[PDB]
């Protein structure tokens, strides 16, 4: 690799690996459109398997992001349309608070203060139902945003209704096959299990329990190398040959929000740049009044688009920058703080700008 990529990344990530005490760590730079790998550690420490470039990580949070994406190629496929009532996909869904909460709302976390977590109690189909027709806002839809597994897991699930296909199914033929993501998983099926790194928690080996909508909301697993190829797709997605595909991923880079100096498209969260990392988890409920922006502006170029994400024994991190054809991708199997992920990729990225 050039020595600087070399350089930047070794003398970022090892200090970040010591203080942290992360066990394993994956690392692609997209520079210039061509990824660069590094690995550190072990995927297990029991039976001391090394990190490698076909590891399989809990991508925890970052799966969103796949979500979004799926979900802009069913509004590009004319299935499904942001401006849509969440009901329309929903019949059952008849409890008044509902009126007035459309898709866009589900997508960005602006339905009027969905909970983070879906409670474990909630399993079959029928308990979700119950769930979400029990839930009562806080606040009127389209006013705050309150991150939440529960809301953007919700437009998931819905938003393939009209597909016929399961979530799992649309995400594999419609997203993960054409970009050739071909270690990518949301279930890891048994002949990939000798990749699937543990995560650890407090020094004990784990991996993500079931839940409702975790497909949807932070269920995939991912190698550094397909997470690198999916960095890619979404800093030139006029590559991809797939149009709703292309325009998917278009769709989920626009502005539909802002709160402060963030912008919330579908999964990606994007801030303009040039921009430092003190304005890019230590808080469990942050609510935050968000402006409309009407309408949603195309996905711009000069922007640092990210996503942190978590599970309890995996820290992710993905931020890239279109303008400049530059990425990264770290993925750790333990869940350390934000801050710390998004300090290191700035100051590689901001070294190779």
Same mark, same amino acid.
Request: no cysteine; charged share 15%; glycine share 8%.
């Given at each position: &690799? @050039? ?22 760590? +994956?690392? +692609? ?13 072990? $995927? ?12 399989? !990580? ?7 992001? !796949? ?8 509004? +590009? ?5 942001? %401006?849509? @009532? ?8 008849? &409890? ?14 602006? +339905? ?59 995400? *594999?033929?419609?997203? !993960? ?11 890891? /099926? ?19 329990? @079931?839940?409702? =909508? ?5 269920? #995939? ?16 997605? =006029? ?10 991923? *278009?769709? $989920?880079? %626009? ?15 994007? =801030? ?12 469990? =409920? ?9 309408? /949603?502006?195309?996905? #711009? ?18 931020? !890239? ?29 901001? $070294?190779?700008?």
């Amino acid at each position: &690799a @050039p020595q600087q990529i070399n350089d930047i990344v070794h003398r970022t990530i090892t200090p970040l690996i010591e203080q942290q005490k992360i066990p394993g760590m +994956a690392v +692609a730079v997209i520079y210039q459109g061509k990824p660069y790998y590094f690995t550190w550690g072990y $995927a297990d420490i029991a039976k001391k398997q090394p990190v490698t470039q076909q590891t399989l !990580f809990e991508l925890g949070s970052v799966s969103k992001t !796949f979500t979004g994406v799926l979900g802009g190629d069913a509004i +590009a496929r004319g299935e499904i349309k942001l %401006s849509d @009532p969440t009901t329309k996909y929903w019949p059952e869904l008849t &409890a008044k608070q509902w009126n007035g909460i459309t898709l866009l709302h589900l997508a960005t976390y602006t +339905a009027g203060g969905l909970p983070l977590q879906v409670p474990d109690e909630v399993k079959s189909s029928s308990d979700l139902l119950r769930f979400y027709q029990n839930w009562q806002p806080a606040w009127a839809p389209g006013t705050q945003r309150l991150y939440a597994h529960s809301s953007i897991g919700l437009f998931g699930a819905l938003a393939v209704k009209p597909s016929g296909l399961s979530f799992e199914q649309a995400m *594999q033929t419609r997203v !993960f096959q054409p970009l050739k993501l071909n270690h990518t998983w949301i279930n890891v /099926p048994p002949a990939e299990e000798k990749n699937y790194a543990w995560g650890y928690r407090e020094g004990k080996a784990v991996h993500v329990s @079931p839940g409702a =909508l975790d497909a949807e909301a932070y269920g #995939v697993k991912s190698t550094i190398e397909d997470m690198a190829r999916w960095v890619q797709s979404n800093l030139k997605p =006029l590559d991809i040959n797939e149009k709703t595909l292309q325009q998917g991923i *278009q769709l $989920a880079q %626009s502005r539909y929000w802002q709160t402060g100096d963030m912008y919330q498209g579908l999964g990606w969260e994007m =801030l303009d740049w040039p921009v430092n990392p003190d304005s890019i988890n230590k808080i469990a =409920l942050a609510a935050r009044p968000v402006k409309a922006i009407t309408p /949603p502006t195309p996905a #711009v170029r000069a922007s640092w688009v990210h996503k942190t994400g978590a599970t309890g024994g995996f820290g992710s991190y993905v931020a !890239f920058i279109p303008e400049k054809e530059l990425g990264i991708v770290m993925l750790a199997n333990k869940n350390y703080p934000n801050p710390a992920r998004v300090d290191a990729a700035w100051q590689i990225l901001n $070294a190779l700008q």
